[PDB]
Design a protein around this ligand. Structure first.
Ligand SMILES: Nc1nc2ccc(C(=O)c3ccccc3)cc2n1CC1CCNCC1
Length: 445
């Protein structure tokens, strides 16, 4: 057996994908950078045995396609799995798209030919994604004509998805109806890609609703339209491909490979800009990211409540003196003890964090060590609020809050009630401090 931190050290956290946090790490000998997804066993159940996971891992390491994340290594210890893959710098596809003056079917066809090409390859090797969505499409580099790299292929088969809403935002729109009901195969990826295509050419989800369950209700019924005025600008062959990919019965649904041969992919890769679709995607994306940011802020405030009190009790018990003061090594031992932590991969990781907080009285260390994380979490929320507020009015209206909280799965009576307690007179709009106050009251503060 071989240990992960013998070989890799953490550089810095990258984000929270499905199943766990992704950490930028560096090989301590060759200096190679890698994106390590760390799966916490204690919060992510397995669907399969160890025998079956080690086999898929062995296979995934051998596979190689320019539109699929390269997986280098797999580690496991008592408490976690470590998936070590190549790191990409171009960001999520949709964030790159919203920063464009123009976007035509030629851009959409090129994007989707890549996605279908990755999928086709994977299905040939009997690997299904199931959870394909825009968050899982990364651009390989910051440069112009760069490859899309699909992440997380094969994982849904071996791990149970979170049922917490901070992990579910923007999954409902893309899931294939047959996955909802239990009997599904590789055709579910074609469906998901079909929904992405739809959104690329109109900027609106084909199945949409006020909340998660309403979205799933629309998907399960399977009915959508091309009524929206901006479809008047999309070719018929594009609509024709969408129809085949969003075909309800999976055996009647076009395959990945066959979609690559479809007339639309054939024509539009080998031309007006969809101006309306871009403005729609830009609004969609801000909305999703602000809802995500809200939920993560609420979560971090609750973790902070938890971890503040726990560290205090640890440092109290450790202070044999009653001095209200601890040594450096003891602050490290009690901080290590707090971990019983994506960044804190080893004892050396923690020492840096302890030394950052210092750069005496344990009660002060506790405030700062958390207050850092508390202020750190606020700023991500602020940025998303600014981004959402695209006309720089400084406010979010009632209608917008309803869209935002609906995506966040906060009951309408519950947030409206919270709004009233924050500002009485109110005037139907909230500024940033009001928004933040509402979220504090939505996590018992
Ligand atoms: N920049 C970058 N390149 C990445 C490559 C892969 C991943 C993974 O989520 C991953 C890594 C290993 C195994 C399975 C998934 C994650 C990667 N990231 C960080 C993402 C980039 C998009 N925003 C959320 C964090």
């Amino acid at each position: 057996t071989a240990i992960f931190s013998d070989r890799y050290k953490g550089q810095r956290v990258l984000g929270k994908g499905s199943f766990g946090e992704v950490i930028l790490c560096k090989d301590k000998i060759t200096g190679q950078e890698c994106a390590v997804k760390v799966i916490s066993k204690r919060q992510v159940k397995q669907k399969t045995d160890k025998e079956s996971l080690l086999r898929e891992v062995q296979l995934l390491k051998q596979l190689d396609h320019p539109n699929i994340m390269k997986l280098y290594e797999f580690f496991e210890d008592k408490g976690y799995f470590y998936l070590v893959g190549e790191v990409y710098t171009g960001g999520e596809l949709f964030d790159e798209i919203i920063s464009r003056k123009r976007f035509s079917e030629v851009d959409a066809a090129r994007i989707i030919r890549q996605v279908l090409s990755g999928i086709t390859y994977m299905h040939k090797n009997k690997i299904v994604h199931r959870d394909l969505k825009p968050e899982n499409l990364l651009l390989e580099s910051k440069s112009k004509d760069a490859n899309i790299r699909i992440i997380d292929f094969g994982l849904s088969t071996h791990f149970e998805a979170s049922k917490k809403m901070k992990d579910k935002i923007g999954t409902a729109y893309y899931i294939a109806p047959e996955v909802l009901h239990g009997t599904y195969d590789e055709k579910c990826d074609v469906w998901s890609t079909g929904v992405i295509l739809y959104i690329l050419l109109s900027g609106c989800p084909p199945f949409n609703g006020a909340n998660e369950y309403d979205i799933l209700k629309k998907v399960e019924k399977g009915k959508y339209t091309f009524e929206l005025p901006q479809w008047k600008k999309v070719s018929e062959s594009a609509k024709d491909l969408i129809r085949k990919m969003l075909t309800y019965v999976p055996s009647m649904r076009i395959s990945a490979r066959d979609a690559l041969d479809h007339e639309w992919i054939q024509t539009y890769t080998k031309v007006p800009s969809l101006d309306n679709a871009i403005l729609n995607i830009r609004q969609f994306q801000g909305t999703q990211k602000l809802a995500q940011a809200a939920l993560l802020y609420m979560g971090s405030k609750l973790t902070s409540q938890d971890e503040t009190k726990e560290l205090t009790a640890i440092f109290h018990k450790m202070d044999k003196n009653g001095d209200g003061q601890l040594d450096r090594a003891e602050l490290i031992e009690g901080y290590k003890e707090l971990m019983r932590d994506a960044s804190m991969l080893d004892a050396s990781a923690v020492e840096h964090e302890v030394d950052q907080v210092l750069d005496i009285e344990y009660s002060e260390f506790v405030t700062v060590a958390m207050d850092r994380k508390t202020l750190l979490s606020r700023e991500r929320l602020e940025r998303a609020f600014r981004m959402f507020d695209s006309d720089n009015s400084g406010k979010i209206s009632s209608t917008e809050l309803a869209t935002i909280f609906g995506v966040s799965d906060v009951d309408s009576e519950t947030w409206k009630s919270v709004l009233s307690e924050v500002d009485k007179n109110n005037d139907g709009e909230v500024d940033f401090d009001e928004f933040q106050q509402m979220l504090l009251k939505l996590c018992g503060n």
